Write a protein that binds this ligand. Structure first.
Ligand SMILES: [Mg+2]
Ligand SMILES: [Mg+2]
Ligand SMILES: [Mg+2]
Ligand SMILES: [Mg+2]
Ligand SMILES: [Mg+2]
Ligand SMILES: [Mg+2]
Ligand SMILES: [Mg+2]
Ligand SMILES: [Mg+2]
Ligand SMILES: [Mg+2]
Ligand SMILES: [Mg+2]
Ligand SMILES: [Mg+2]
Ligand SMILES: [Mg+2]
Ligand SMILES: [Mg+2]
Ligand SMILES: [Mg+2]
Ligand SMILES: [Mg+2]
Ligand SMILES: [Mg+2]
Ligand SMILES: [Mg+2]
Ligand SMILES: [Mg+2]
Ligand SMILES: [Mg+2]
Ligand SMILES: [Mg+2]
Ligand SMILES: [Mg+2]
Ligand SMILES: [Mg+2]
Ligand SMILES: [Mg+2]
Ligand SMILES: [Mg+2]
Ligand SMILES: [Mg+2]
Ligand SMILES: [Mg+2]
Ligand SMILES: [Mg+2]
Ligand SMILES: [Mg+2]
Ligand SMILES: [Mg+2]
Ligand SMILES: [Mg+2]
Ligand SMILES: [Mg+2]
Ligand SMILES: [Mg+2]
Ligand SMILES: [Mg+2]
Ligand SMILES: [Mg+2]
Ligand SMILES: [Mg+2]
Lengths: 144, 60, 185, 67
RNA sequence: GGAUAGUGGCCUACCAUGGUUUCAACGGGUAACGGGGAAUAAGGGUUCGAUUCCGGAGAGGGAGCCUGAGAAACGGCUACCACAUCCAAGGAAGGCAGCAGGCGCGCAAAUUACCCAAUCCUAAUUCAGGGAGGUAGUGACAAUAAAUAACGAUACAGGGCCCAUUCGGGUCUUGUAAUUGGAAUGAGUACAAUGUAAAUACCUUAACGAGGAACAAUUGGAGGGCAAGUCUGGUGCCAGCAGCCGCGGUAAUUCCAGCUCCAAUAGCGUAUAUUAAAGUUGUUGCAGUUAAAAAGCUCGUAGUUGAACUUUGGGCCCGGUUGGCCG
RNA sequence: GGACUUUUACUUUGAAAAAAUUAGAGUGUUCAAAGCAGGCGUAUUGCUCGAAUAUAUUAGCAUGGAAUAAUAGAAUAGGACG
């Protein structure tokens, strides 16, 4: 029969066996260990707001040649320092330093995205004003 | 690898593309009428069958 | 501390987002019966989908089963009443079949046009939402009304508005006000 | 217009069995206005700090004008 | 025996050595209140439930207690701990996990408004009270219905079609049209009545209220997966794109735009989680010679599993429910 | 009423079973999501249909079955009936 007990009373063994083998599932393992709460910069939450320390020049991976504009951010609720990407064109002109920014995931479930090495987050808002909006003409960046 | 690269060129191309203004155009109908406008365009009279069909043809 | 107000959504959405055949097939249906939404198709497919499910499940039961006979006949008699289901095929192996257009064909949107009164599916729309026509002396502004087929004979223009005759109305009476004022004293 | 109505066997009968806001609507009863609902509450709570009739407490606080 | 309203190691005295455990005790974790239920639709499943009902627990943290039918009560008291307010420095006083409201916390959440008219509750009680509850305000949480246009005429153009020796446009409409035409309606505005506890909106409905300067729909995308350009301009492995594959180093089908086009549309994108796709957790239903994977070998307890055989066969009776040929 | 009875599993039917939610009948909220309304007249002194049904699975209770799979019996006869 190849392995699994086919008996009518063997329910225990069949349960316990699945229980054991779930741990080989990456998603199941993370969920129970509480990896989100323990590791990872966000508290497990969807976004986290933080503060800009310096503006990085991160150079793209191969076979790409570029300089990807990014910022080192210190999450408020944490202290955890994190480097995040500032999307589209310019927009690194919108940020500067000691500014408040809203970080979001990159979509890849951890796992930095493109040719950009080691960057797992991206900037959504600065000074409460939403990079997108700034980028077209729609809004303007506040006083101080 | 390298982390501090130059930030000077940020925004380069967007800042140097020559601006051309949006040109004023007939206002397209919103709602059912647009669906209608599509229907009669896509199906009823059609346009050109050349080789199969074409939706947004250029200088063909 | 109140009983929850219950609710349900009336539509479903296709899994394959871009299917050129389904899209074409969709647009035509809209362009015919005069619908502004893909949702107005999505809704019908969802209603049809639950009906076929009920029908499907009933069929697996033994013939002349008490639940099957009772509920089956009800489904049939409901469907027949509104005019989707043909009188000839009453036994619900055809409700299992049916199809979308059979439902669409019964909308007050369409019945008002099929009967004349409009001479466009789109003219039909605008008339209905504009507080014209009626079933009883009761006015109906919803294009999705689903004429009950025994109310089919009573579709006509309203006691109010022009076209059923009331009074020409502000846009016409405006011109009549500009005719007697400019030409006369 | 679909609606509801009652007809009492006399006008004395109506006045006793009718909601007092209706007799107002009709004019069969005057609306006697009072302080704000939260004004009355505050009055009660102020009143609660006084044990007795309190006009005796007006004289003892008049003695304060001396000391 | 004592204690309790009362059973009981609940407590005490005397006596004894018992009680649970691989069928997992004991211990640890839980970003754990339990349940009715929620999400996901072949089925089997998987994940979720602080939260409209039910049960439990708590009232800053502990303990203790008075009152009473009922509390180990906190909009009751007493003490300690932690907070913390007023003062004339002697002292006194507070407990929003009630309603609003403020700070803090953060990705994350509304008015210091009105009323007991309803729903019901309490009291000495038809009356009083009720931030229970209702009302409105804030409110793209989720859910439903569905405006942003409808109809002609005319100007060439066409496909129809009867004829074609050959001009062709003629009446059946396909509509692209940079002059036209009168029709229609609510979005709003607003007498009035309706509504309401009093108001507000809705439903009604006088007077007003549509021609592009509008009462002007958006949000993403247009190389592939994936529906829609190899158009023009710009940049030149830069700036940027890009879930993934991949684009950009001078004619870029991926960047920055203009034009045009697609999809969904009062909504559409993104991030995080979960579910389906997943027969990549496999009871249904996986795989293990070489792709990840049979313990060096045999014994062996727990566990799972375990050959065949013991009233079958024949006879009689009673009365049901469908379906036929007939009515 | 007396005197006694080898133990189980499985299956059947049924009782006991909150509502809201789910599935679902009826009813034209103008449609619909809903709600549990409503529908008829002599519309001047009333007539009237409703507010169904299904699911509710382990355990416990009650009942029918006796295949399948266990358990016990009589061998130092300390057996069985009277
Ligand atoms: Mg391993
Ligand atoms: Mg690569
Ligand atoms: Mg650094
Ligand atoms: Mg913290
Ligand atoms: Mg009061
Ligand atoms: Mg008093
Ligand atoms: Mg011992
Ligand atoms: Mg264990
Ligand atoms: Mg907890
Ligand atoms: Mg709960
Ligand atoms: Mg739970
Ligand atoms: Mg919590
Ligand atoms: Mg402690
Ligand atoms: Mg206490
Ligand atoms: Mg309090
Ligand atoms: Mg209390
Ligand atoms: Mg002093
Ligand atoms: Mg509060
Ligand atoms: Mg919110
Ligand atoms: Mg209140
Ligand atoms: Mg608009
Ligand atoms: Mg206009
Ligand atoms: Mg666009
Ligand atoms: Mg394509
Ligand atoms: Mg180019
Ligand atoms: Mg482009
Ligand atoms: Mg979508
Ligand atoms: Mg099975
Ligand atoms: Mg495999
Ligand atoms: Mg190898
Ligand atoms: Mg190997
Ligand atoms: Mg081996
Ligand atoms: Mg071993
Ligand atoms: Mg056997
Ligand atoms: Mg049962």
């Amino acid at each position: 029969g190849k392995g699994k007990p086919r008996g009518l009373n063997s329910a225990r063994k069949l349960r316990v066996h699945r229980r054991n083998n779930r741990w080989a599932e990456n998603n199941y393992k993370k969920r129970l260990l509480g990896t989100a709460f323990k590791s990872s910069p966000f508290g497990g939450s969807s976004h986290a707001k933080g503060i800009v320390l310096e503006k990085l020049g991160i150079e793209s991976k191969q076979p790409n040649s570029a300089i990807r504009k990014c910022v080192r951010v210190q999450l408020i609720k944490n202290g955890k320092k994190v480097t995040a990407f500032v999307p589209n064109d310019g927009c690194l002109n919108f940020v500067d330093e000691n500014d408040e920014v809203l970080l979001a995931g990159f979509g890849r479930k951890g796992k930095a995205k493109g040719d950009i090495p080691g960057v797992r987050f991206k900037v959504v808002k600065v000074s409460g004003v939403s990079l997108l909006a700034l980028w077209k003409e729609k809004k303007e960046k506040p006083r101080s | 690898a390298k982390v501090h690269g130059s930030l000077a060129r940020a925004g380069k191309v967007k800042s140097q593309t020559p601006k051309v203004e949006k040109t004023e155009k007939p206002k397209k109908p919103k709602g059912r009428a647009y669906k209608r406008l599509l229907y009669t365009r896509r199906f009823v009279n059609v346009t050109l069958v050349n080789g199969k069909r074409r939706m947004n043809p250029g200088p063909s | 501390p109140r009983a929850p107000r219950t609710y349900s959504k009336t539509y479903s959405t296709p899994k394959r987002p871009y299917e050129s055949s389904r899209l074409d097939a969709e647009l035509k249906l809209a362009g015919e019966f005069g619908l502004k939404n893909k949702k107005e198709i999505y809704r019908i497919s969802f209603q049809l989908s639950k009906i076929r499910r009920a029908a499907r499940d009933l069929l697996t039961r033994d013939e002349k089963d008490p639940k099957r006979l009772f509920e089956g006949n009800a489904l049939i008699r409901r469907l027949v009443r509104v005019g989707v289901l043909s009188e000839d095929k009453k036994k619900l192996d055809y409700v299992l079949a049916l199809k979308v257009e059979d439902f669409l064909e019964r909308r007050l949107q369409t019945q008002v046009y099929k009967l004349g009164l409009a001479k466009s599916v789109h003219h039909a729309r605008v008339l209905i939402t504009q507080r014209h026509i009626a079933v009883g002396k009761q006015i109906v502004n919803i294009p999705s009304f689903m004429v009950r087929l025994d109310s089919e004979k009573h579709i006509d223009f309203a006691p109010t508005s022009p076209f059923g005759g009331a009074r020409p109305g502000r846009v016409a009476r405006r011109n009549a006000a500009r005719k007697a004022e400019a030409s006369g004293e | 217009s679909v609606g509801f109505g009652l007809v009492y066997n006399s006008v004395a009968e109506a006045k006793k069995f009718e909601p007092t806001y209706r007799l107002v609507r009709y004019g069969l009863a005057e609306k006697v206005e009072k302080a704000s609902r939260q004004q009355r509450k505050q009055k009660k709570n102020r009143d609660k700090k006084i044990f007795g009739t309190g006009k005796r407490l007006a004289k003892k606080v008049a003695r304060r004008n001396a000391d």
